[PDB]
Amino acid sequence: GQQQRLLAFFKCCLLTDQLPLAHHLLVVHHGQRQKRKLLTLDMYNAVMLGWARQGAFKELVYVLFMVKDAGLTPDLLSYAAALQCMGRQDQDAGTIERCLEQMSQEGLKLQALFTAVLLSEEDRATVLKAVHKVKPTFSLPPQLPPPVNTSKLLRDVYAKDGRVSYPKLHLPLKTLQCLFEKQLHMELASRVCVVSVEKPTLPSKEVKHARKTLKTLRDQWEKALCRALRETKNRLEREVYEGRFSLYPFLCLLDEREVVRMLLQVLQALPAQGESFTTLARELSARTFSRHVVQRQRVSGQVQALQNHYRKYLCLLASDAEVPEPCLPRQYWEALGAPEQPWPLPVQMELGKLLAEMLVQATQMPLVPVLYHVGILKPHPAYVQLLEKAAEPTLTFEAVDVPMLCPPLPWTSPHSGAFLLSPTKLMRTVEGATQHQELLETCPPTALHGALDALTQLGNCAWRVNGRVLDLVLQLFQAKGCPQLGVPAPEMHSLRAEALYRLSLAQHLRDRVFWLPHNMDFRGRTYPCPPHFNHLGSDVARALLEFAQGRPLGPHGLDWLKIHLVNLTGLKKREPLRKRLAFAEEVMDDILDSADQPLTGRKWWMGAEEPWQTLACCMEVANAVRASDPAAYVSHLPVHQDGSCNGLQHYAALGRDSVGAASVNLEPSDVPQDVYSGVAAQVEVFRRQDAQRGMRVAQVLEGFITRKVVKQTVMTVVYGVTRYGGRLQIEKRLRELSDFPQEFVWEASHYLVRQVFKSLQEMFSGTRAIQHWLTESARLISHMGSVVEWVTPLGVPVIQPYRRKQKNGFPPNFIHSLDSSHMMLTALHCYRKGLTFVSVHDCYWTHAADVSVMNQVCREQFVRLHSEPILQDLSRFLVKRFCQLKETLQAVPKPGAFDLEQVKRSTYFFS
Numbered sequence: 001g002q003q004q005r006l007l008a009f010f011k012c013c014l015l016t017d018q019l020p021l022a023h024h025l026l027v028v029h030h031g032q033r034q035k036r037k038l039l040t041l042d043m044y045n046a047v048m049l050g051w052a053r054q055g056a057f058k059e060l061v062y063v064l065f066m067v068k069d070a071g072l073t074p075d076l077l078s079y080a081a082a083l084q085c086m087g088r089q090d091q092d093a094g095t096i097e098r099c100l101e102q103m104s105q106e107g108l109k110l111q112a113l114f115t116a117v118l119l120s121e122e123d124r125a126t127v128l129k130a131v132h133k134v135k136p137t138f139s140l141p142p143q144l145p146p147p148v149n150t151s152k153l154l155r156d157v158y159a160k161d162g163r164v165s166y167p168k169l170h171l172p173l174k175t176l177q178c179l180f181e182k183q184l185h186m187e188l189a190s191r192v193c194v195v196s197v198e199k200p201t202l203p204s205k206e207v208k209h210a211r212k213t214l215k216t217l218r219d220q221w222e223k224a225l226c227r228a229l230r231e232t233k234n235r236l237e238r239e240v241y242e243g244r245f246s247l248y249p250f251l252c253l254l255d256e257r258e259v260v261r262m263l264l265q266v267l268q269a270l271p272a273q274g275e276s277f278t279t280l281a282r283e284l285s286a287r288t289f290s291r292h293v294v295q296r297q298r299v300s301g302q303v304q305a306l307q308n309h310y311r312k313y314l315c316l317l318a319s320d321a322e323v324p325e326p327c328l329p330r331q332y333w334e335a336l337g338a339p340e341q342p343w344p345l346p347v348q349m350e351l352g353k354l355l356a357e358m359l360v361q362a363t364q365m366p367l368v369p370v371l372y373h374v375g376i377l378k379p380h381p382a383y384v385q386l387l388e389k390a391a392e393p394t395l396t397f398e399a400v401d402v403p404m405l406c407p408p409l410p411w412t413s414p415h416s417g418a419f420l421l422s423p424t425k426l427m428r429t430v431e432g433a434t435q436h437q438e439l440l441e442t443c444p445p446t447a448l449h450g451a452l453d454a455l456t457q458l459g460n461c462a463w464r465v466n467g468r469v470l471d472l473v474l475q476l477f478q479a480k481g482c483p484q485l486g487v488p489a490p491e492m493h494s495l496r497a498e499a500l501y502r503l504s505l506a507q508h509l510r511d512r513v514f515w516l517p518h519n520m521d522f523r524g525r526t527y528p529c530p531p532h533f534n535h536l537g538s539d540v541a542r543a544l545l546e547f548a549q550g551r552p553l554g555p556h557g558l559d560w561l562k563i564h565l566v567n568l569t570g571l572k573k574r575e576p577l578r579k580r581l582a583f584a585e586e587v588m589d590d591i592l593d594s595a596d597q598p599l600t601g602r603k604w605w606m607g608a609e610e611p612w613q614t615l616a617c618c619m620e621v622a623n624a625v626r627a628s629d630p631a632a633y634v635s636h637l638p639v640h641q642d643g644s645c646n647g648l649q650h651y652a653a654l655g656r657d658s659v660g661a662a663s664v665n666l667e668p669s670d671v672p673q674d675v676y677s678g679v680a681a682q683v684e685v686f687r688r689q690d691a692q693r694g695m696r697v698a699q700v701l702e703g704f705i706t707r708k709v710v711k712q713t714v715m716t717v718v719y720g721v722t723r724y725g726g727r728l729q730i731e732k733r734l735r736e737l738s739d740f741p742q743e744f745v746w747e748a749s750h751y752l753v754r755q756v757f758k759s760l761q762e763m764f765s766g767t768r769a770i771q772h773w774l775t776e777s778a779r780l781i782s783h784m785g786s787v788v789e790w791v792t793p794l795g796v797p798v799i800q801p802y803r804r805k806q807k808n809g810f811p812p813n814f815i816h817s818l819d820s821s822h823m824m825l826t827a828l829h830c831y832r833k834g835l836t837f838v839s840v841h842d843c844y845w846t847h848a849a850d851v852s853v854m855n856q857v858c859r860e861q862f863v864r865l866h867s868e869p870i871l872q873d874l875s876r877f878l879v880k881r882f883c884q885l886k887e888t889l890q891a892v893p894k895p896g897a898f899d900l901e902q903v904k905r906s907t908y909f910f911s
């Protein structure tokens, strides 16, 4: 522990340029006997590297002498620091050769230094300059070409033979550079102030007095915190000079201004009900570390190098700019060259405790303290009352939460990508994050390249808020709200608070396009990085966003737009595309009326399943048909396509079950079939039978079973393992339209889930067999004291963070990974073909013009994925990994009789 603290102290001294203090502390440690043993060659080499970077040959020799006196041998790091100092000071070739001869006598090699010692570009250049003075013919081995994956699936994707026509952003190179500069400035600021979208009364009797007194209190708090920080820093300086270890360099690492500003921001964002003391200390320490990381990237020239590289990388995305050879964003970034350590837990904890105690001490108000000990730091009732009376309209958000205004950095590695100056991991999950990351690092780099390119593609998409829909939603939200349409009205209080955050951000991004960086989960489902964009399934959010880039509708663009409007309305679900288009043409008068006068009129859209999306589609088709040439009209609206229960689709594809394929519409058919309606009829029959037998739940739950509840139950059974969209949402859907007593809603939901599960088991034989096999395999692997692990068809390793839950989650997780691989393949092929494709909550969004091409690519990639021996490869991997278990793994479910190629002909596969 103490050795770790000392190592962290020396590393922080190196980062802060406090080599005098580091040297003093090391000399004290060496002079004191019992403390000499606590030192380590790592700390010696850290101090040596610091003195070398600063150019102190005398001090470097002194540290080497101390090392030799401590019975320690010089290592590659010490020799690297020595050579760096020699090259920096232009030392003599004689001394250089003597040092190299000593190093060779010690048994170390010169070529192994550049490979085993971690050094920056400047240090490497200085060491090479020093070496060349004695060995001018010493050149490091030339870098090899980057490796490209050649998987049976990604072969056509990464093949140079296949022709490509990737898309190009509409913004010009200069505007892209300007937006990059804006994003860089905002991320350096680290905080953004947005105007609230709540009607301001602006009174003077109470609000102005509250605001003025709060300003006075803020000034007092700031000028007290400054004094407290200065006193603490002086105390720590004296403590270190005395000999004992402290957090002086850690405090000096961040500017006093930044420290006090972050403290005040945390105090302002403190919840009224209160927050835990340990949580506050952890937050303070993590914030200090992150701000230190960003300011270090700034001062160390890393920001300048990133800007220099980005100005060139934007040539690929910019339309006017043309690169020599077309290639993926990650490939271009790696070709141009990508520029290149968490603190100890106890150090972070002590720093957080110190900062929190300093805050609690310097916080005084008319003088009584502000934070009290209830370890729960609850604010002052008077303070929260004053803040409420003030009601500052501005709201503060983190630079990472706000969507980026420039193309996200391509995902070059699990760590490098997405945000600019902020480190972003590939997997969002914090449970087992260490396991996920170590597995992703262990598996071959070429394996993850597919997923990284897929994420880069999904991220490199421009978005903008729809002005009309945003204005309408704001008018409804401010005018007492409209729960019917989904707009909250002033539980509900939390929903209103959240909606205020999202709508406020929407107003901020009214006239500026943004980009959404995407990360993954342990299952493989992609999710936007910003936490405010989590609620993407809402019709409000779905109608607000639109692709900033718009393409010509083309010949079938208007037909596809009308079909999408009909699907959103949901009035004609069983009808085919021709009859849907006929109905769209029939309700053309109401569509135009809705597009012209939404608020005042027939409100036809209001009588739709998704009112906001229906209204947006009405506006779009109106603007399209009102122009001279409807095909010439440019569309910016995302058209969504989904497969009825992708989980059951994948199950049927794996089982080759003809009945299941016909039910989930895998086989060609002129009319679409609703597996939801089939399961609804089955569960209704089961309810009737159980009611005749004598079950009160079945007797009372008569007729209320509807397509919506059946869809939710199927999603929970096929895609649900206590996750978002499960039994809780089933209960919510039931209550929302519940005319029966709510006392047994929980039991009714349980019974419905059970009956739907049994009905699915009875109907889908292949699904039943595959689910039973996976369940038994997971159960046995858990009984053997191991966690279930596998590899997706693409190559991404997947592990379960749960530490039976594994038994119940293995089949859903496998199906999720299959769907994610299918989506990644479809997205990669669309990007190769020059299409704008995104995945938003199991619904593929594209443009109205390229819907046919997207569906074709989806069918082709689905057949390609399910043509490989997925189950056989899974069984072989499981056996090789965990080796009665082997017997069950070998007993792969028998495949049925079904020509999977027929999927290519199915026109209702995705609708």
Ligand SMILES: C[C@@H](Oc1ccc2c(-c3ccc(F)cc3Cl)cc(=O)oc2c1)C(=O)N1CCC[C@@H](C(=O)O)C1
Residues within 6 Å of the ligand: 465, 486, 487, 488, 495, 498, 499, 500, 502, 503, 505, 506, 507, 509, 532, 533, 534, 535, 536, 538, 540, 541, 542, 544, 545
């Ligand atoms: C009421 C509902 O309006 C919205 C509005 C906007 C968003 C956005 C968003 C943010 C910025 C921007 F520029 C464009 C958009 Cl689109 C993203 C998002 O992800 O969500 C939104 C929701 C709302 O805030 N909700 C939260 C509580 C649960 C939800 C539900 O109905 O269950 C509803």
